[PDB]
Amino acid sequence: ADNYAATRYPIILVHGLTGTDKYAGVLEYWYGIQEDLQQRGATVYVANLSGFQSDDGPNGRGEQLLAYVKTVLAATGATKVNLVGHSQGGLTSRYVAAVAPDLVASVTTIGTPHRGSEFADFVQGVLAYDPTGLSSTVIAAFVNVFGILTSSSNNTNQDALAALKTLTTAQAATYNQNYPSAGLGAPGSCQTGAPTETVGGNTHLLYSWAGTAIQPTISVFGVTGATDTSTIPLVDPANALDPSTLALFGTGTVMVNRGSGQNDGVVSKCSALYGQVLSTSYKWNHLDEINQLLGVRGANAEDPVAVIRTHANRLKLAGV
Ligand SMILES: [Ca+2]
């Protein structure tokens, strides 16, 4: 213990897809990160939202988080919170920052698809290929039951198709239209915006970082091969001990063929840019960003727990 990560305002960790579980259910989402932060003097809360849903909407994750923030403020006696989200959680965070600017002090997005995911476009295109349209109903029924069963609170508010639609490239562009941010650059620019945003009296510190383990190598006959820079070639134990390692290399290959460029298996570099970009050089796949699975990472991957801890100190020195 010490006060290295002792920020003025409480930190709320915001999850992306999968299960309406903040963590727990069958394993914590932010693996070992809450314990580490607490040990260094931080007040941390983990949001428990719908794993499958859109961010906006009456029953979306955005309104669920707003409610949660209010509960935390009432409990801690604090006046604002620092929001840090991974994946879709970064989009849920932007919603609260937009809808309730006076209750937010900073927004940090880790591997967030601000411009959507090319892999999402792929999955939906596949689903839409069924001329009878029956598959979409069955897979939705299957993913929804999964969500409620994996949910810690066994939340019945799941909508697999809404969540899929949300991570889509086209839908993201509409989201950015409805919930603009000074941290965002022009669409199609692959550029970031300003490091802060002042929503009338309230100023927000904006940060982001991406993982770019999946790099495009060569193209031949149309296809482009990719490389997983987070692992030592072939022999890396991560390939054996963490099944998401190879899985994300594969989804990352599909993305490279959809013109995404370097990515983390789900989100590309350009789609993740927001506010003050601390780095896009991390050799991490989408799940390494949150120290998964069970803390397993490739030999070339930076320590995610260390980066997040260092960031809580960054906020502290910034005054939030
Ligand atoms: Ca991993």
UniProtKB/Swiss-Prot annotation:
Residues annotated to bind Ca(2+): 242, 288, 292, 296
Q: Which GO terms describe its molecular function?
A: metal ion binding; triacylglycerol lipase activity
Q: Which gene carries the instructions for this protein?
A: lip
> Which cofactor names does the annotation list?
Ca(2+)
What's this protein's function?
Catalyzes the hydrolysis of triacylglycerol. It shows a preference for triacylglycerols with a chain length between 6 and 12 carbons.
Sequence ranges assigned to domain AB hydrolase-1 in this UniProt record:
10-222
Q: Identify this protein by name.
A: Triacylglycerol lipase
Q: Name one GO biological process term.
A: lipid catabolic process
The disulfide bonds in this chain are 190-270
Family the UniProt entry places it in? Belongs to the AB hydrolase superfamily. Pseudomonas lipase family.
Catalytic EC class: hydrolase
Entry keywords, A to Z: Calcium, Disulfide bond, Hydrolase, Lipid degradation, Lipid metabolism, Metal-binding, Secreted, Signal
Quaternary state and interactors: Monomer.
The UniProt catalytic activity note for this protein reads:
a triacylglycerol + H2O = a diacylglycerol + a fatty acid + H(+)
* A GO cellular component annotation in the UniProt record: extracellular region
The record's active-site residues are 87 (nucleophile), 264 (charge relay system), 286 (charge relay system)
Q: List localization entries.
A: Secreted
Which EC number(s) does UniProt give? 3.1.1.3
Biological source species: Burkholderia cepacia
Matching Pfam families: Abhydrolase_1 (PF00561)
Q: Describe cofactor binding as the record notes it.
A: Binds 1 Ca(2+) ion per subunit.
At the top level of its lineage, which domain of life is listed?
A: Bacteria
Q: How is its activity regulated?
A: Inhibited by RC-(Rp,Sp)- and SC-(Rp,Sp)-1,2-dioctylcarbamoylglycero-3-O-p-nitrophenyl octylphosphonate. Also inhibited by diethyl-p-nitrophenylphosphate (E600).
Residue sites binding substrate per the record: 17, 88
